[PDB]
Amino acid sequence: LSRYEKWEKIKQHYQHWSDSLSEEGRGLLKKLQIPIEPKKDDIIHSLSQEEKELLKRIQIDSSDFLSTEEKEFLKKLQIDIRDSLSEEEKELLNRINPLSEKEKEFLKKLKLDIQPYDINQRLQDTGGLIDSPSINLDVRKQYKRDIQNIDALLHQSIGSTLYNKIYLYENMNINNLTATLGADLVDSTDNTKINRGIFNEFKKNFKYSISSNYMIVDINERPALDNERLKWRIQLSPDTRAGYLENGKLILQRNIGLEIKDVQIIKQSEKEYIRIDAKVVPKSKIDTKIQEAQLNINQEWNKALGLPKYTKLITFNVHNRYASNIVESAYLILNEWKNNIQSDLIKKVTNYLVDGNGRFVFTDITLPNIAEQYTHQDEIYEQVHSKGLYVPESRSILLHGPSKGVELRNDSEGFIHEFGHAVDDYAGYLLDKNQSDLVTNSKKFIDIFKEEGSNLTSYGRTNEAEFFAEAFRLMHSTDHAERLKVQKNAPKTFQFINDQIKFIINS
Numbered sequence: 004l005s006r007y008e009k010w011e012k013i014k015q016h017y018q019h020w021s022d023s024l025s026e027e028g029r030g031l032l033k034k035l036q037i038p039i040e041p042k043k044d045d046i047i048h049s050l051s052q053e054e055k056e057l058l059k060r061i062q063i064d065s066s067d068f069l070s071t072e073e074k075e076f077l078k079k080l081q082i083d084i085r086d087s088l089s090e091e092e093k094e095l096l097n098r099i100n101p102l103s104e105k106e107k108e109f110l111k112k113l114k115l116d117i118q119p120y121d122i123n124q125r126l127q128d129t130g131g132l133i134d135s136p137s138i139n140l141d142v143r144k145q146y147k148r149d150i151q152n153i154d155a156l157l158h159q160s161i162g163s164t165l166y167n168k169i170y171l172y173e174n175m176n177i178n179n180l181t182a183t184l185g186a187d188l189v190d191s192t193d194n195t196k197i198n199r200g201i202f203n204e205f206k207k208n209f210k211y212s213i214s215s216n217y218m219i220v221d222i223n224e225r226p227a228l229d230n231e232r233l234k235w236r237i238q239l240s241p242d243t244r245a246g247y248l249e250n251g252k253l254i255l256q257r258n259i260g261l262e263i264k265d266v267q268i269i270k271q272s273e274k275e276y277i278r279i280d281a282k283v284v285p286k287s288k289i290d291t292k293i294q295e296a297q298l299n300i301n302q303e304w305n306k307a308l309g310l311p312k313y314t315k316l317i318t319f320n321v322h323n324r325y326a327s328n329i330v331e332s333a334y335l336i337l338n339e340w341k342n343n344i345q346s347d348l349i350k351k352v353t354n355y356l357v358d359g360n361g362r363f364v365f366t367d368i369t370l371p372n373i374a375e376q377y378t379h380q381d382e383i384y385e386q387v388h389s390k391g392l393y394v395p396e397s398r399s400i401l402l403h404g405p406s407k408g409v410e411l412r413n414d415s416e417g418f419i420h421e422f423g424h425a426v427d428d429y430a431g432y433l434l435d436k437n438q439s440d441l442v443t444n445s446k447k448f449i450d451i452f453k454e455e456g457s458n459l460t461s462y463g464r465t466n467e468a469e470f471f472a473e474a475f476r477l478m479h480s481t482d483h484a485e486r487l488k489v490q491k492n493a494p495k496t497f498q499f500i501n502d503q504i505k506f507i508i509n510s
C-alpha cells in the first residue's frame with residue numbers, strides 16, 4: 004500500500020499494548036535499543052599511575068582476544084590518557100612486534116571492565132544460553148532478569164490478519180554474518196557491485212537463520228547506510244510476537260527461526276545490494292534440521308575414520324543468523340582436512356581425542372560460551388574468544404564461523420592450525436604417558452623456537468605452541484609454495500614436526 008498507511012496500521016494494532024506499558028517497561032525497551040556504554044572517565048580513574056603509563060604507550064592492535072570494538076574503545080581511552088602531552092609526543096607515539104606478558108595480563112583483566120551492558124549482544128554471544136559463566140555472576144543475573152521481563156512484555160502476536168499483508172525490513176552489515184566473506188562479497192574493483200561468484204556460494208549455503216536475540220525491524224525499508232549491503236525483507240508468522248517501537252519499528256520476540264526463501268542481487272540508487280527474503284518459522288523446525296545434519300556428519304565421518312558408529316565427535320552449536328552456513332562449512336572444512344593431511348595422522352590423533360571424550364565444535368556463539376572451554380576455565384580473564392581454539396583438558400577443537408582469524412585465509416586453514424595443537428598434545432603424550440605434557444614443551448623444541456621462532460608468520464612468534472601450530476598449518480597448505488617456505492626458512496622446525504608425525508603414525 005502506502006508506507007505511511009502501513010506504519011499507522013501496525014501502530015494501531017499495538018496501540019493498546021503501547022499505552023499499557025509501564026515506565027519500567029519503556030525504560031527496558033530503551034535500554035535494549037541503546038546499550039549502556041562504559042564511561043571512560045571512570046575506567047581511567049580506576050587505573051594506577053603505572054597502568055595509565057602502560058596503557059598510554061601500548062601496542063593495542065596485537066591481541067589474541069580483543070574485538071575490533073574493544074580495540075576501538077581502548078584507543079579512545081589511550082587518546083584521553085595522552086591528551087596532555089606534547090603535540091610532538093603523540094606524533095611520535097604512533098609511528099612505532101608482539102605483546103609483552105605484563106601487557107597481555109593487564110589487557111586480559113582490563114577487558115572485563117570495558118563491556119557495555121548490551122542485552123541483545125549477550126543473547127547473540129551466548130546463543131540464548133545466558134547462564135554461561137562468561138561474565139560476572141551479578142551482571143549475569145541482571146541480564147537474565149531484563150530478558151525475562153522483555154519476554155513478558157512481548158506477548159501480543161502480529162496476528163492472523165496482518166501477517167501476510169506486510170513485510171518488515173532489516174538492513175545488515177555483511178560482516179555481521181561472517182567477517183571473512185564480507186571483504187570479498189563486494190567487488191574490489193567497483194564497490195557499487197556485488198562479486199557474482201562469491202554471491203552464488205553465499206546463496207547456495209544460506210537456507211536458514213536463527214535469531215537468538217530480539218530483532219529490531221523497520222516497518223518500511225530504510226535506505227542503506229555505510230556497510231549496509233544486506234537488505235532483509237521478512238514475512239512474520241501469525242503467532243510471531245512483537246512490539247511497536249517509536250519511529251516505525253518493531254521489536255520481535257527472541258528465539259525465532261527464519262527460512263531463507265530467496266537471495267537476489269538488486270539495484271538501489273546506482274549501487275548493488277543483496278536482497279534476502281526470509282519467512283519466520285518455528286525455531287524448533289530449524290533446530291531439527293541442525294540436529295539431523297549433526298547426526299549425518301558424524302555418521303559419515305565415523306565411517307571414514309574407523310570410529311564406532313555412534314561416536315559423538317562433531318558438534319553443531321548453532322544459534323545465530325548465519326546458521327545454515329555454519330553447518331554447510333563444517334562439511335567443507337573437514338573435507339579440506341582429510342584432503343591435506345595423511346589419513347594415518349588424522350586417525351591416530353582423532354582416536355586420541357575421542358579417547359578423552361573430545362569434540363570438533365563448529366559454532367556461531369563466542370568460544371567462552373562453549374562448555375568444552377568454560378568448564379576448564381573458571382576465570383573469565385583467562386577465557387578466550389577467537390576464530391579457533393584447542394582445549395587439551397577437553398581434547399576439543401572449537402571453530403567459530405562468524406569471526407576472522409589473525410592473518411588467516413579461510414576457516415579450513417584455521418582448523419588445520421587447531422589440529423596442529425592436537426598433534427602437539429598427542430606427541431607429548433606418547434613421549435610420557437605418565438606426566439602427560441605438550442611436545443612443544445620439550446627442551447629440543449624450546450631451543451628450536453629460540454632460534455627459528457621469528458622466521459614464519461608474525462603470529463607464530465607468540466610462543467612454542469603457536470609456532471609449532473603455525474608451522475604445522477603452513478606445512479599442510481594447499482599452496483605448495485607455502486610448504487616449501489617452511490623447509491626453507493625454518494628447517495629444524497620442519498624436520499622436528501615430520502619426526503613427530505612419523506613418531507605418531509608408527510606408535
Ligand SMILES: Cc1cc(S(=O)(=O)N(C)[C@H](C)C(=O)NO)ccc1F
Nearest residue numbers: 067389390391392393408409417420
Ligand atoms: C593463524 C590462526 C589464528 C587463529 S585465531 O583464532 O585467530 N587465534 C589467534 C587463536 C588464539 C589460536 O591460536 N588458536 O589455536 C586460529 C588459527 C590460526 F591458524
Ligand SMILES: [Zn+2]
Nearest residue numbers: 420424469472
Ligand atoms: Zn593456536
